């Protein structure tokens, strides 16, 4: 191996010798074998478990359960403060286990998309995973790719490569294959950067440890994760439940001490009542529903890189895609050649290979039998920065098209036949790409110029055109015909590139125009039906012509008999208000720059929607950064796109979009199951609590109690209601608003609902036992039975806000069938089980006891099932 | 509308002979070109056997002095021959037929559904 310094200051030939590097032909297998057995893998060699454990233990309401805790073992009560620390245990147990399963899953999909570069080995280019790279490969760089390893270039055609990652500076940087004597190494192409332009091939310097900024990778790894917005959000609102209850249990408190009552029980109570209140199994249950959203969509194929993204697909209701790439499988095609003159060619076969003849009027054409065929196959071929190494292609798939029109001509050779001194690149902004090129072997020929790119600037940099083998001063009635011609193709399907050949800029030769056929992605238009069907905009954001925007949308059917299509010179015309206005209405965009689609991203956002933009190509990662929701194309996308986005499609289908939306719609429903059930039987004991201080009758449940209770309704009873299931009808709802409105009117009426029922019919049961003005064990018994009863209705009630019980079934959690059953079990040990009767101060009951408090508690299935079959039927 | 039919495809040893038949509804008379594409996980589809309007064939530089080709109009079918296989170029199969068009630029290419081959190392 090599210093990257070092190797910059020393020749080409001389690191080549060094590392016993081929230029030409790349290592054979042995001796690649031999340098993994000395070098290595590529890896950063092994990237803490009780690491998170104690993580989980920062959070807030975790510290107010350990202080009670602390406070409880001070005041020593060596059963209270053992039972709060099961609960803490359980629940920072089960947020483990989530969390472990859900980073495991997704780092297999990750291993499903590995890190690849095209490497030439053999002689034949492979596509070789950067972790197999030993040093001295030869590896060839396309565009928007990122370097597999430490490499030293040998051959750069035109290259940008940006440097964000590893320096810190936006800006891409030329990298030239000439040795650097004596960051400012214009030569090395480094490790992680990524390839914004052009073509290139190097020899790799370095693997593994050897890279000389692996470092920024390790911090990178180790950099964390920050709270999601709905963990800041349910974590502000469980210090907001967690304060209230202190101010009510405070006041409880103080008035039972004024009214008269044990300070030590009082305090117990207190304590016990305010580990309850605490919503320590919301945090744990925001994180189970993430995480078991993150392995939902695993079993997708849809790689979550951020956690955010999971909450967000769920309000996600605009999504901005791309026609190429995205909405076309982008195995581009030249298939219609139309000459500046009118001949018409038909260019058959598929794919990027020599294979397909070119026919005019019926006849084949090689070479340059056609002249004007022939130059047009000529600048498509001398223009690019792709080559069909061993039928594969490296750079963009519309100059590959190009290249394999030029093979299927005869006439691939004249790229090798010309000096690209200037290159005017490709960018979005430009639409057109230029060369200045001289002949080999004709050296006195003058600096020839080819032009290719959209017929618009194309035609505006042309000021000639050619005729019969003629140049000829462009007129406007053939640039009338030119247009129609465009716009015909257009709307048969066809990407259309116009061409130009002349001296100089500005004084081109317009020879003609290629219709590149791009069949879009199969699967998109059923997707696009249901997505739509779903409540869920689409829009196709493009940079090509409106014909062939519009034809694709049409056959894909987000663009129907009466649909608005806006060009990107209206949008930079237009105003952002505007642009607000029109921009539901309009369903494709066309000769859209990045800019312009960054805009029209903003102006969807200024709406209050949350975007989902789908992207491929080098240009399009603003745009996927600026989204809501960054969506790239697993297999046939480019480095620059996955690294930029927020959830990689493995197998790319527009459905899984869906199923990311669905599984995001779910999870807040999950929450809300949660925090109804915890927060209505937390009012219930707390207002019964409450009651009992006021009217100065006996408390109905000790603190033992009210912890076994909340082991109840925070821990695995409470934690399944996270895990239930999601429906099919809030499946077809409309998209959820942004804001996260947990609490709303119908959740809190139904919340007081429950806690009124369970604290009349607890108190019930207390008051039907205290009718003899006894104090036996046996009343405290039926009233914490009748507690723990109502508690287990309200969960088997809580599963669902508008589905009844009925419906939604027993069987379909089993977490929730485990949870009440093991609560049940309990229960009755804490009732007949007699070391379980003397620390929880209890006295065993009749079966008629039990019958009795079955049926009584039932009372809030009973009337939530009667609100939820009401609301269904005024909903109908 | 031509509709385009596969056939023939089977399990066949390495060294055997194996047969396919591409059928077409219409006359082929007027279709220019014609031929085999292979596509294999993985990779892109390649090309594997053809035949053009001036009668010439076509042929993947791989796969070149092992596959033939031929047409005949009366069973309106391309039959494809495949002698001396390897494990290695196994795949699934698609014809497809392109036609000469010119007012419409739409491309009159007919795919096949495909069908599946696979050969595993000998023993
Ligand atoms: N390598 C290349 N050389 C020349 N012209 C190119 C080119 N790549 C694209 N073009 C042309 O540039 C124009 C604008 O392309 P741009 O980069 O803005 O979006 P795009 O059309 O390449 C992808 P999409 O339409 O899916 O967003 C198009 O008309 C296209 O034909
Ligand atoms: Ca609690």
Known sequence: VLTSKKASELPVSEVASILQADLQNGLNKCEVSHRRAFHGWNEFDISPLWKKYISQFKNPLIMLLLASAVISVLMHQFDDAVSITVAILIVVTVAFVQEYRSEKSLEELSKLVPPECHCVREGKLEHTLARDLVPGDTVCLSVGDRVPADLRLFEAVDLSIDESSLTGETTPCSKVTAPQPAASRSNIAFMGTLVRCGKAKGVVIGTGENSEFGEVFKMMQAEEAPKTPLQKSMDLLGKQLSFYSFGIIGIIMLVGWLLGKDILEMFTISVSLAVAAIPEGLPIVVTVTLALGVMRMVKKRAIVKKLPIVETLGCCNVICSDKTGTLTKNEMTVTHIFTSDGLHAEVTGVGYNQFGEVIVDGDVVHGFYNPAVSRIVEAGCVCNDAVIRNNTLMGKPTEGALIALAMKMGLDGLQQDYIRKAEYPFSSEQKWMAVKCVHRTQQDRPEICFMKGAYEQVIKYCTTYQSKGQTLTLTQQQRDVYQQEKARMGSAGLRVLALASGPELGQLTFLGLVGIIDPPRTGVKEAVTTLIASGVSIKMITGDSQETAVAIASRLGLYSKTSQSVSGEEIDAMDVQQLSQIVPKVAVFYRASPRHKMKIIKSLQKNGSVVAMTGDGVNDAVALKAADIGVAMGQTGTDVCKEAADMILVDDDFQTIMSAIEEGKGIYNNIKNFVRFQLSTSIAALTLISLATLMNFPNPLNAMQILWINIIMDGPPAQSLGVEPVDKDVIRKPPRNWKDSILTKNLILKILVSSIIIVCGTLFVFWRELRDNVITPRDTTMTFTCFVFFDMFNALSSRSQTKSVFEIGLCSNRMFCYAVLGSIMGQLLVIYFPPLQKVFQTESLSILDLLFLLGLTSSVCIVAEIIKKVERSREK | ?123
């Open chain 2, 1 to 123: 509308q031509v509709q385009l039919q596969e056939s023939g495809g089977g399990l066949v040893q390495a060294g055997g002979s194996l047969r396919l038949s591409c059928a077409a509804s219409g006359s082929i008379f007027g279709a220019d070109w014609m031929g085999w594409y292979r596509q294999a996980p993985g990779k892109e589809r390649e090309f594997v056997a053809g035949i053009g309007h001036g009668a010439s064939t076509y042929y993947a530089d791989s796969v070149k002095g092992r596959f033939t080709i031929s047409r005949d109009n009366a069973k309106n079918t391309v039959y494809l021959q495949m002698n001396s296989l390897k494990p290695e170029d196994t795949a699934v199969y698609y014809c497809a037929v392109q036609y000469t068009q010119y007012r419409s630029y739409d491309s009159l290419l007919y795919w096949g559904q495909g069908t599946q081959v696979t050969v595993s190392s000998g023993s």
